[PDB]
Amino acid sequence: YSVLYNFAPFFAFKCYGVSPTKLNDLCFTNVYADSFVIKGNEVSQIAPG
Amino acid sequence: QTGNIADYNYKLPDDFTGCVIAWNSNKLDSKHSGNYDYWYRLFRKSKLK
Numbered sequence: 001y002s003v004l005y006n007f008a009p010f011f012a013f014k015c016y017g018v019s020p021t022k023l024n025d026l027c028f029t030n031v032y033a034d035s036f037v038i039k040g041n042e043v044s045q046i047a048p049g
Numbered sequence: 050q051t052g053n054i055a056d057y058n059y060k061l062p063d064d065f066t067g068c069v070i071a072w073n074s075n076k077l078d079s080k081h082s083g084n085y086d087y088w089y090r091l092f093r094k095s096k097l098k
């Protein structure tokens with residue numbers, strides 16, 4: 001998760017389900033990652049509900 | 050119990066004695082268009098005694 005932490009300015013880091021700090025040891029099998037490009041305000045508009 | 054809420058906010062003692070009362074209260078705790086007056090801390094340095 002260093003690349004997620006150090007690489008790129010990571011302008012958006014907000015999330016509500018699982019803490020991004022107590023995550024290095026936490027371990028799953030599959031993760032659904034989707035990539036797309038938007039402007040500044042849509043990044044903020046990205047949210048649940 | 051292990052997790053986030055039971056690990057940072059409220060930890061029941063291992064040698065607990067007594068009773069636990071549970072009942073769903075949707076009308077008295079939720080309202081239309083969101084109700085996030087309540088707060089639970091999922092970020093803590095360590096587990097809670």
Ligand SMILES: *[C@@H]1O[C@H](CO)[C@@H](O[C@@H]2O[C@H](CO)[C@@H](O)[C@H](O)[C@H]2NC(C)=O)[C@H](O)[C@H]1NC(C)=O
Pocket residue numbers: 094095096097098
């Ligand atoms: C509340 O007092 C307790 C003393 O028992 C302390 O809480 C611990 O603080 C250490 C660091 O000083 C942490 O590593 C532990 O994880 C803490 N444990 C708990 C259960 O909080 C501290 O002095 C006070 N805690 C806070 C958050 O101010």
